[PDB]
Design a protein around this ligand. Structure first.
Ligand SMILES: Nc1ncnc2c1ncn2[C@@H]1O[C@H](COP(=O)(O)OP(=O)(O)O)[C@@H](O)[C@H]1O
Ligand SMILES: [Mg+2]
Lengths: 58, 77, 526
């Protein structure tokens, strides 16, 4: 109302950083959803290659 | 909208048609990739168990309520 | 600085003006770091590690945070040490002790700037804490005569403890589990008798306390999978090649048929021992070690259940639940007492299969199943529930309680204020600073919720001075209220430990005037 000034901005920034980071992951796997979605290829550092559509595996 | 996008359709047009058709009667209306539009779903023999939808929703809201409690990040050993 | 050098290379010294500067900077630094996690509306922090392989945890506890932080200021290590000890003592109030111990030093630096000798402050505070603890004792209310009234107090204490944690989403559900679990111990403070099993999957509200017991082991092959009206023999002995004959003997024969004779004598030894076990008339057998595949079939032919590799914890818990005896040497069947449960079966939770004991005889131990969505929720739920179980166990040991929500702090802060008005000298100033520190704790709770802390605290100060010794804050609406009506209740032992420990650390730090560091060791890893 008239007072209760919030002098700390760190909580407001960390929340907005979490919103952006969490949203990014959902946009990453949005393609692999549906009967007409496609797969992905994951190449490990060892050299292993996997081709998958499973969302937990990606 | 995501299913209507991956199939090369107009997402705005499809979802607007879907919400219209669910508000005046039938509830089984859904996206039909084979036909390319919106039609009755049970005629296409596409179903799924109830536990999949309920569990997906319940686990999602529990996590989001957990995220909003966070306030700070620090580095430890 | 004297021109002559007295210290080796790398060693450093700090003195009065610089020493007291560093010690105060460290203390308020740790105090302000954890103030955000205090009260019914505090938030949680994230701890991620650069060294321990990027481990990640989300917590609200004030002691877990201070253990993982890598502090290096000498004065900050004193504050961390009190918080760890407090957790191992009563299990709650880790956040309140460090904030209070830091707010005392914040007021102490201002007093030094007014040219008062440090020894004067300490002698002043020593009188303030004595009158503060005595006033708290006169506020204690002691129940225990009436079961119905005592049952209510346990629900009130557990309800208050769970407020600041993640369990506040389901406080009603989780209050019943915590209270009923502690009533099973029948007054024995063996908290290890409660096994909290946490496995991932499902909602957080699916957690419950099992009416019997659960074991995460597997039975032998080709043995009955379920038994009704079971008799249990609990043993701690060797059965996988039990022939560890302690001596240093050896076999020396001049043929091969002699070896095949001695080999057959080995199986006769194991067979004879099994018969002496079956003489007890049992139908369920539990062992804390492995079971070889030969004695396995002996039970499989006799229609018995054999559980193997249930470690010391897994055996001692079963003894309390069913009342049997952990026996060995199996030579006198009359002197050994067996257990009794109504039914044993196999149940599936999530994916795994666990052994279910139902209708047990004693039940002086229990198991709790926790469910959730993420490993962070499961860890937080288990750690939060540890606070509730411990503080309840202290209440049963000493059943006298003190009101909370800021009602307790304002009462003691007034008692010191009355004393400071009769004492002449500079000691009067120090005692007043003690009251300023105690009253900060109710203020900090109001700040985190977004309320006018100054107005609310001002009303409390007037209410406690005019004799309304049960006034205190109400979080759900941001006004004042009665605790006898609402039911915010703490433990007398917990508040006493918070007060005494906090006042001591500000004493030991304040007497220091010189800081000396030896030259550190250099990192030359293996
Ligand atoms: N419902 C409530 N109303 C008012 N005060 C509460 C309520 N629940 C908890 N508190 C207060 O919150 C304070 C801090 O407790 P907590 O958040 O667990 O931190 P600590 O680790 O110091 O116990 C306690 O002094 C208690 O009186
Ligand atoms: Mg607490």
């Amino acid at each position: 109302g008239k007072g209760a000034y919030q002098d700390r901005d760190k909580p407001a920034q960390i929340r907005f950083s979490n919103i952006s980071a969490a949203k990014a992951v959902a946009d990453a796997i949005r393609t692999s959803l549906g009967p007409k979605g496609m797969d992905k290829m994951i190449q490990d550092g060892k050299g292993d290659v996997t081709i998958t559509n499973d969302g937990a595996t990606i | 909208s995501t299913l209507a996008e991956n199939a090369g359709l107009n997402p705005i047009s499809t979802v607007t048609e879907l919400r219209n058709r669910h508000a005046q009667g039938e509830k089984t209306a859904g996206i039909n990739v084979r036909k390319g539009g919106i039609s009755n779903i049970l005629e296409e023999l596409v179903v799924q168990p109830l536990l999949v939808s309920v569990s997906a929703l319940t686990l999602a809201t529990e996590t989001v309520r957990s995220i909003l409690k966070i306030d700070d990040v620090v580095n430890t050993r | 600085l004297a021109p002559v050098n007295i210290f080796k290379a790398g060693a450093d010294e700090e003195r009065a003006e610089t020493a007291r500067l560093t010690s105060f900077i460290g203390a308020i630094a740790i105090g302000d770091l954890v103030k955000s996690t205090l009260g019914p509306k505090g938030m949680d922090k994230i701890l991620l590690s650069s060294g321990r392989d990027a481990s990640l945890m989300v917590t609200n506890d004030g002691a877990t945070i201070l253990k993982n932080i890598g502090v290096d200021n000498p004065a900050a290590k004193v504050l961390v040490d009190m918080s760890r000890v407090q957790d191992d003592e009563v299990g709650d109030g880790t956040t309140s002790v460090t904030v209070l111990a830091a707010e005392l030093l914040r007021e102490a630096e201002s007093l030094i700037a007014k040219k008062i000798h440090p020894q004067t402050i300490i002698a002043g505070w020593r009188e303030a804490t004595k009158a503060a603890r005595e006033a708290l004792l006169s506020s204690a209310v002691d129940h225990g005569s009436d079961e119905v009234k005592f049952r209510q107090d346990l629900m009130n204490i557990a309800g208050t403890t769970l407020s600041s944690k993640l369990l506040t989403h389901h406080k009603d559900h989780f209050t019943k589990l915590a209270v009923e679990a502690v009533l099973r111990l029948k007054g024995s403070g063996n908290l290890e008798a409660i096994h909290i099993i946490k496995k991932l999957g499902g909602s957080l509200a699916d957690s419950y306390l099992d009416e019997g017991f659960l074991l995460d082991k597997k039975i032998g092959v080709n043995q009955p999978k379920r038994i009704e009206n079971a008799k249990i023999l609990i043993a701690n002995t060797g059965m996988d090649t039990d022939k560890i004959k302690i001596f240093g003997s050896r076999v020396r024969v001049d043929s091969t048929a002699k070896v095949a004779e001695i080999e057959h004598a080995e199986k006769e030894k194991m067979k004879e021992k099994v018969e002496r076990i079956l003489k007890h008339g049992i139908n369920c057998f539990i062992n804390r070690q492995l079971i070889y595949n030969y004695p396995e079939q002996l039970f499989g032919a006799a229609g018995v259940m054999a559980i193997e590799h249930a470690d010391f914890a897994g055996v001692e818990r079963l003894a309390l639940v069913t009342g049997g005896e952990i026996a060995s040497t199996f030579d006198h069947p009359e002197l050994v007492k067996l257990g009794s449960c109504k039914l044993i079966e196999e149940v599936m939770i999530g994916e795994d299969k666990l052994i279910h004991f139902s209708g047990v005889a004693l039940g002086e131990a229990c198991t709790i199943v926790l469910r959730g969505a993420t490993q962070q929720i499961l860890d937080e739920a288990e750690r939060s529930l540890h606070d509730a179980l411990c503080v309840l166990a202290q209440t049963v040991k000493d059943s006298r309680t003190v009101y909370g929500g800021g009602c307790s702090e304002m009462l003691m802060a007034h008692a010191v204020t009355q004393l400071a008005n009769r004492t002449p000298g500079k000691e009067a100033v120090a005692m007043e600073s003690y009251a300023k520190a105690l009253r900060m704790l109710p203020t900090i709770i109001a700040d985190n919720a977004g309320y006018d802390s100054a107005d609310l605290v001002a009303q409390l100060r007037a209410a406690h001075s005019e004799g309304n010794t049960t006034a205190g804050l109400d979080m759900r609406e941001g006004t004042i209220g009665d605790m006898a009506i609402l039911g915010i209740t703490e433990s007398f032992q917990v508040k006493r430990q918070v007060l005494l420990s906090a006042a001591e650390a500000a004493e030991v730090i304040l007497r220091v005037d010189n800081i000396i560091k030896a030259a550190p060791r250099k990192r030359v890893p293996d």
